[PDB]
Amino acid sequence: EWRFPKSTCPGRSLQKMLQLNPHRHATAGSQAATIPNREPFISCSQDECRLFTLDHDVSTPGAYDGITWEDRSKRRRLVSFPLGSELTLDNMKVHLSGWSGTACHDGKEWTYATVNGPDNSAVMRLKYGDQIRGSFPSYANNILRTQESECVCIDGKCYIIVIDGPAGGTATPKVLVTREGEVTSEIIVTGRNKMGEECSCLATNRTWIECLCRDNAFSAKRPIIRIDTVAGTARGYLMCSDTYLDTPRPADGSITGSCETDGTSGGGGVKGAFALSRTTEATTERFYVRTVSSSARSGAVFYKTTDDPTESNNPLTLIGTAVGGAIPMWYSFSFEIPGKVCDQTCIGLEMGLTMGHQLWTSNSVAVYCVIGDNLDWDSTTDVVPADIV
Amino acid sequence: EWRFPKSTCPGRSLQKMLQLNPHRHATAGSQAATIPNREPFISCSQDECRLFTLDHDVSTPGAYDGITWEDRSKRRRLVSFPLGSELTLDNMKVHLSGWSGTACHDGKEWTYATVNGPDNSAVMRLKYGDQIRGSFPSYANNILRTQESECVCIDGKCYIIVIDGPAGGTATPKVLVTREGEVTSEIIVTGRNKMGEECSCLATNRTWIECLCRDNAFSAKRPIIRIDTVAGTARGYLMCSDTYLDTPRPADGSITGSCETDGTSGGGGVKGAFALSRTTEATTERFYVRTVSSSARSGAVFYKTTDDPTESNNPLTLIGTAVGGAIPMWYSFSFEIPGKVCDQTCIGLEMGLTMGHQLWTSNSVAVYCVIGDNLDWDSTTDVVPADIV
Amino acid sequence: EWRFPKSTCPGRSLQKMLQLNPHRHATAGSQAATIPNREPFISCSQDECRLFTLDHDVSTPGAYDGITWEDRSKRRRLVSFPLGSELTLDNMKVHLSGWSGTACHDGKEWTYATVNGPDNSAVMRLKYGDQIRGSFPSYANNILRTQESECVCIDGKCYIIVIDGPAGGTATPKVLVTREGEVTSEIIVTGRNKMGEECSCLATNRTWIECLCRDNAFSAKRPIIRIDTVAGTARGYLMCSDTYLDTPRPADGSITGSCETDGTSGGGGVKGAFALSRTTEATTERFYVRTVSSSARSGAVFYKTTDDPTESNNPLTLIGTAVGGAIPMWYSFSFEIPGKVCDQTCIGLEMGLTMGHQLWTSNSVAVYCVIGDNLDWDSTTDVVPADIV
Amino acid sequence: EWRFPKSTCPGRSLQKMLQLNPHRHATAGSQAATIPNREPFISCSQDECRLFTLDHDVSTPGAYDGITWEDRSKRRRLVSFPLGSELTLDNMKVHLSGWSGTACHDGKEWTYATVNGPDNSAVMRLKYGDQIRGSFPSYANNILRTQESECVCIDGKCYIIVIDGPAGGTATPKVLVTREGEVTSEIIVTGRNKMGEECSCLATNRTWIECLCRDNAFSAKRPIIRIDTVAGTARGYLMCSDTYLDTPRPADGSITGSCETDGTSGGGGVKGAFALSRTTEATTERFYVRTVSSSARSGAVFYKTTDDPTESNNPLTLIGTAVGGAIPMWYSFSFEIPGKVCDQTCIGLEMGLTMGHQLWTSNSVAVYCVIGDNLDWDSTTDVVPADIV
Numbered sequence A, B, C, D: 001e002w003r004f005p006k007s008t009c010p011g012r013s014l015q016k017m018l019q020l021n022p023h024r025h026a027t028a029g030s031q032a033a034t035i036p037n038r039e040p041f042i043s044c045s046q047d048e049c050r051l052f053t054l055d056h057d058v059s060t061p062g063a064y065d066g067i068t069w070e071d072r073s074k075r076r077r078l079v080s081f082p083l084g085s086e087l088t089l090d091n092m093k094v095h096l097s098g099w100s101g102t103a104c105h106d107g108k109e110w111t112y113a114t115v116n117g118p119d120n121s122a123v124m125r126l127k128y129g130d131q132i133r134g135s136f137p138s139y140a141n142n143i144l145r146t147q148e149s150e151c152v153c154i155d156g157k158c159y160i161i162v163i164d165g166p167a168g169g170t171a172t173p174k175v176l177v178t179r180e181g182e183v184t185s186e187i188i189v190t191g192r193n194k195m196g197e198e199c200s201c202l203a204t205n206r207t208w209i210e211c212l213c214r215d216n217a218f219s220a221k222r223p224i225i226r227i228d229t230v231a232g233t234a235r236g237y238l239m240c241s242d243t244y245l246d247t248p249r250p251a252d253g254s255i256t257g258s259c260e261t262d263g264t265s266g267g268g269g270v271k272g273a274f275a276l277s278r279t280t281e282a283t284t285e286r287f288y289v290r291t292v293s294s295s296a297r298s299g300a301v302f303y304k305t306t307d308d309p310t311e312s313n314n315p316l317t318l319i320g321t322a323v324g325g326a327i328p329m330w331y332s333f334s335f336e337i338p339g340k341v342c343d344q345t346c347i348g349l350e351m352g353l354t355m356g357h358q359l360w361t362s363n364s365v366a367v368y369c370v371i372g373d374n375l376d377w378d379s380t381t382d383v384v385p386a387d388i389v
């Protein structure tokens, strides 16, 4: 009936699943209406996985596709594609207008959520199946926004992290608890709770959820939020590892002080992601990604650890380079593929494609999952934005 | 088994669901065969919602798409798209030839209905699943025509409003009662019954239906038709509110006389729409739309009331502007999304796009549903018809 | 379980269902890969109807589409589209290579059949679901060929009419009886059996089938074949009505002699069609089509009769003109839409489109079904082949 | 429940099913995004058959499609199409990145497998439904590679042949045994086991599998591998027939020595295929293909035999020419269509299309299945690569 976390399929590394690269098909002579997009993620039911993303109400090639750099507009929508369908106009399914999104399947129906509206009075609407069942208005009136990756559903309840407030200062996250799309509860995040954008969330055992977030203002360490679904509580932490996962970031281990010390830099950031191995009682291994560059959104390197990331300052263990340092790599996202016997967690990579500042912008999506013993291959796009018609 | 009205999901305002905007993809360089269309509406089964519309047997760009301004021809068909699919040639499904349409799902099968034929001897055909099960010929031999929005099915019977007669004079509506597409009964509309085109209809409780119509000849007040499905009767009224909902219209409250007094103007009009909150016994709130302009089809403003619209001349309560006054806005339509626990009513807006008189004509469709506490955002198209190839 | 004929939904005329017109989308500026085709027909399961046709392994516009006039080649295939999908490359489903075809659903699985091979040694292959279960080689080694419309399945057995032999002389038809695609029996057609191409077949009651065919060599009267599925016998007749249904044809009633007298002309012909009303015991009304012109394939006129067409020379009763005489109209085909409570028979019209002799050739398909009391409207294409890119 | 081999539908020859030819639609004026590809094959579940192939992350026409000659890159993916859908961008479904592939359905879920990674450290990943359940790293670190045709699933276990090692020397094949995508066992191939690439495999009775392979280094005779699924053993043989099936090859019967003697030539080769008739206990007839030319990959000729191909040096019996000798014909592949009453085996032909060395490269796929008594027709492409835009 209801979705719930199982023990994960055994795996000791990350290996490539597939890649979607729609703008390979937007060159001279081509015959495709491709969908430029940003903030992609993947979410799955027991029947099918789907690639979700935020579009701009336009295809490429096309005269209007110059707006695709914008973060927020009346044009953007949360859309999705069956996973493995290329990202073309006829394959696209529109779910909700809005410019920040999340989605997750509870075992019976999809929940889709987007934020729509002006910056100072936006509203999250939650769609359950075909009906808008939930509505959650901005509480700090400064760009209400959510995960840009899948939410987590356990035992008929879904858990969504939202944040509202300045990009350059304190902004308090909230855990929304939904039931058939209705917001039935808000959970206050205690502990280290002054930031936490764009969380990538995965269940760590049968009843707990762990989210890896972005602190855009205070620290190059990523915030971590843990949710106890039985107690209905949430606590924020700062990831303690010397291997800082945000971009931009200082040299590894150079932040002086306790685990929860911000550091002197910390402005700016990017959505990050992780994967894991777990039994029904505990997570036994974690897998992390960060950029190759400590200053630009370029490259992707995988790491792993068997320590608790909220307690240990130990450096992470290098897995290898999944995207070379010369290749733009922007957001990454966590997701889980449910199975009848075991679950599997994965990391998707937003390989960015752009003609430049305030010009055409989109991506290619590469997917790696927890399986095997060594990284198999790195990913490239072989798309030159200059070649896009 | 059979569809029947449930209590609606709680909601105190209208908030945006999604928007379809196919002709964003018909610009120079684009690679899409988009479907120009008019009189769109949405109807849902428990499985899926669908966007229905009347096409012209052509795509845009294309050499033949200059006929898309015509109301009636041998080219038009009732077609549909899964809701959320963009309106392209490969996504389209053709149901019936004809130039006035409606459709509704009874819980087991779709009923589709169109009027086909010459102006003076048209015929409504009703398709149930894959078979044409019903046929209803013109009774006044002057453009038989129907709702251009979904019909209402209760307990295995579907209710369709048709009208026949002059656009500028008395034309008597009829309620057709269908069972598996067969017209089993005609219900005579008593009361105020001299006009009533293009009705948008919703169940007001377990057994009654209310339709909001267009009087093209006599009044800027909209006619309202109520159907008692148990008694098998229908009665027409004139909406009494000072906030007149048709276009063109005089200043609010300036019509002198009783609730049912026409007023001195009243020629012309446009299809209108409403939404509601209801329990199984009674409607508890109504939501209305009208244009911003009192003379042109431009803009869309939402209103609400807890009064009976056939009894109260009280002004409606402003919700806010859903489409700015500088933006063409033509038809609007009511529809209902059925759910397993509650139903939800919505209003769709036909945001018109045209190069001018007897030139290319189509639209974008924005959808708002009853949910939340304040209007979230207004809608735009950002399509300039001059840019369409 | 198994498909079997029910009493037909009540109806006293033919009225338009829909029309497919893919080459409206093949004009300058258009963005569609349309499928040029000939010999279309429709066949239905209880789930969906499908438009079948014979393609040429090409789309229009395209450099190779000049071969679309050919009757037989290694390029042609039996393909199909969900009924209501427009005839584009991405909507097409390929079933079998070959240049003469038929298909019918027995209640459990589709049977598809085509003839493939050279003129002097062609082979019919029969596909049941996904497997080729049947094979029937040419028996006269002179263009084995079949109905170009749906076969008829009763009680798990399907009935297919095939013919082999000269187009200008005696060619003996055979009734093939199939079970899960395997040819289990050949039925010898007795009586008037020297011709009978391209039969359109419908059940006339619970256990009998009637086929309306084309005599390409001897007569402007159409041959009729009746099959008794219980006895497993078939007998050929000549339609006796003064209203001769083939093209070309002499003036009505001018053939002198008995019902089975050929007449002095009779060379050439075209596939024809009929529809009917029936109970479980007997057919009570028949509906026929023929061209407007007695010499060219142009126009379509509907007729009806309550007489036995193998016994009565009475003229048929005019219903009206479904396609005007200035409009090319080639093949027509019979088909039946099964229902849970009643069945419905229909006639489809191949409205031909061509640039001329040995040039680009395709069609538009208009569908009329037995319902109502008067013909609703005639059909046009509004496609000028000169405009096709 | 689980898939297992049944007796095959009776048939004594090979006859054409269908052909897919997407690049007929890539000519001047055409409107299709076609998918250039190589190493196609077909695999079926009880619900549907699917055409699998290895793409290049590009469509034709398009600026990037010049890489389509490459064997291995970071661009290639195992993709599939419902069998009968033409090979266009919107019809394509991406399963796994990689440049050597196989897939097979066990009765419950699809298993997909590809090899990804650099030549010296590639990794096979196995996807079961939506999850990557298996991982198998290169064991000789010299281009791990697999069948390029469907694997065989019996009683919940699937059997995949892999090889690793030099293309010009000894390379040891391994039989991988999978259960829900997990590699549970490796079976050592005994006997003649120094080569065996690109095996086409079919069950020969209820419990045994026979694979027809390519020896790229030692012999023009094809290796044959038999798997006993009950004992869990595999043994390699050399096909003994004087009618040598590989290309290039010496004159028939001119290899001097025993059945297992290599011969003095033997360098180079091509993937080959066979089909069969079987009961639940034994194979009763085998059908083989080879090229017309003994030196180039051109043409296709069918043969048959009732002898054991590992024991008899008897020449095979000619069936006839399926593709004329002037037409390029590259890989061929075995596959089986499961049925409820009987199974059917088939051979697909990769009819190659290329502009030349290190230029655009793709194919057309023709399918022949075991049915009937004589070959019905040969196949052509009528695609001139010079005409491709």
Ligand SMILES: CC(=O)N[C@H]1[C@H]([C@H](O)[C@H](O)CO)OC(C(=O)O)=C[C@@H]1NC(=N)N
Pocket (backbone or CB within 6 Å): A039, A054, A070, A071, A072, A099, A100, A101, A143, A144, A145, A148, A166, A167, A197, A198, A216, A269, A270
């Ligand atoms: C709601 C919103 O606009 N979110 C922004 C996000 C945001 O600016 C930062 O996290 C600071 O708050 O940054 C960026 C980014 O690329 O850094 C993309 C996101 N765009 C979208 N999700 N449409």
Ligand SMILES: CC(=O)N[C@H]1[C@H]([C@H](O)[C@H](O)CO)OC(C(=O)O)=C[C@@H]1NC(=N)N
Pocket (backbone or CB within 6 Å): B039, B054, B070, B071, B072, B099, B100, B101, B143, B144, B145, B148, B166, B167, B197, B198, B216, B269, B270
């Ligand atoms: C059957 C028919 O032609 N209905 C007309 C409708 C009609 O003219 C008026 O209501 C007056 O009767 O007006 C208009 C309109 O835009 O005002 C569109 C509709 N077009 C279509 N439904 N095709």
Ligand SMILES: CC(=O)N[C@H]1[C@H]([C@H](O)[C@H](O)CO)OC(C(=O)O)=C[C@@H]1NC(=N)N
Pocket (backbone or CB within 6 Å): C039, C054, C070, C071, C072, C099, C100, C101, C143, C144, C145, C148, C166, C167, C197, C198, C216, C269, C270
């Ligand atoms: C097998 C075959 O070629 N059948 C022909 C058919 C035939 O020539 C006549 O009936 C005389 O035998 O005529 C014509 C026609 O338009 O008259 C189309 C059919 N074309 C196809 N079914 N491909």
Ligand SMILES: CC(=O)N[C@H]1[C@H]([C@H](O)[C@H](O)CO)OC(C(=O)O)=C[C@@H]1NC(=N)N
Pocket (backbone or CB within 6 Å): D039, D054, D070, D071, D072, D099, D100, D101, D143, D144, D145, D148, D166, D167, D197, D198, D216, D269, D270
């Ligand atoms: C893994 C790999 O590259 N396999 C090659 C294959 C291989 O080179 C030979 O068998 C020698 O080992 O040959 C060829 C070929 O056309 O001969 C295509 C295959 N290409 C692909 N399967 N992508």
Ligand SMILES: *[C@@H]1O[C@H](CO)[C@@H](O)[C@H](O)[C@H]1NC(C)=O
Pocket (backbone or CB within 6 Å): A204, A205, A206, A207, A208, A280, A281, A282
């Ligand atoms: C999951 O982990 C948390 C934190 O360690 C623990 O409190 C909880 O009991 C665990 N749940 C189960 C079902 O073991």
Ligand SMILES: *[C@@H]1O[C@H](CO)[C@@H](O)[C@H](O)[C@H]1NC(C)=O
Pocket (backbone or CB within 6 Å): B204, B205, B206, B207, B208, B280, B281, B282
């Ligand atoms: C619905 O409302 C009508 C009008 O007020 C009323 O007559 C009828 O009884 C109501 N139906 C139910 C089931 O309460």
Ligand SMILES: *[C@@H]1O[C@H](CO)[C@@H](O)[C@H](O)[C@H]1NC(C)=O
Pocket (backbone or CB within 6 Å): C204, C205, C206, C207, C208, C280, C281, C282
């Ligand atoms: C169908 O009609 C035929 C011919 O009139 C007749 O012989 C047969 O009995 C009828 N079948 C049934 C079931 O009535």
Ligand SMILES: *[C@@H]1O[C@H](CO)[C@@H](O)[C@H](O)[C@H]1NC(C)=O
Pocket (backbone or CB within 6 Å): D204, D205, D206, D207, D208, D280, D281, D282
């Ligand atoms: C299948 O054939 C093999 C080899 O001849 C034989 O050993 C085995 O017993 C056969 N299986 C069955 C089920 O007959």
Ligand SMILES: [Ca+2]
Pocket (backbone or CB within 6 Å): A214, A215, A216, A217, A218, A219, A220, A221, A246, A247, A248, A266, A267, A268, A269, A270
């Ligand atoms: Ca930061």
Ligand SMILES: [Ca+2]
Pocket (backbone or CB within 6 Å): B214, B215, B216, B217, B218, B219, B220, B221, B246, B247, B248, B266, B267, B268, B269, B270
């Ligand atoms: Ca009015």
Ligand SMILES: [Ca+2]
Pocket (backbone or CB within 6 Å): C214, C215, C216, C217, C218, C219, C220, C221, C246, C247, C248, C266, C267, C268, C269, C270
């Ligand atoms: Ca004739």
Ligand SMILES: [Ca+2]
Pocket (backbone or CB within 6 Å): D214, D215, D216, D217, D218, D219, D220, D221, D246, D247, D248, D266, D267, D268, D269, D270
């Ligand atoms: Ca060799």
